[PDB]
Amino acid sequence: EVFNATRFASVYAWNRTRISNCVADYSVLYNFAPFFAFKCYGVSPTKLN
């Protein structure tokens, strides 16, 4: 749901969200992403699951 919202808010009012009580599978993130920038700092993007 977070990825195919049709009205991503502008930067000046950066809309927040909360992700809790769920199983984070980032394969869906990979699927819904012609990735251009996936620079991960505090964690390795390969090892997320």
Partner 1 sequence: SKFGAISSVLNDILSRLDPPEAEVQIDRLITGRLQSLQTYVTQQLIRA
Ligand X SMILES: *[C@@H]1O[C@H](CO)[C@@H](O)[C@H](O)[C@H]1NC(C)=O
Ligand Y SMILES: *[C@@H]1O[C@H](CO)[C@@H](O[C@@H]2O[C@H](CO)[C@@H](O)[C@H](O)[C@@H]2O)[C@H](O)[C@H]1NC(C)=O
Measured from the CB of residue 3, what is the shortest distance to ligand X in angstroms? 3
Nearest residue (CB) to partner 1, 9 versus 25: 25
Alpha-carbon distances, residue 36 vs 18, 21, 41, 45 (angstroms): 24, 29, 16, 14
Residues 14-43 that bind partner 1 (CB under 8 A): 42-43
Question: Contact with ligand Y (CB under 6 A): which of 6, 17, 20, 44?
Answer: 17
CB 48 within 8 A of CB 27: no
Binding status of residue 13 toward partner 1 by CB under 8 A: no
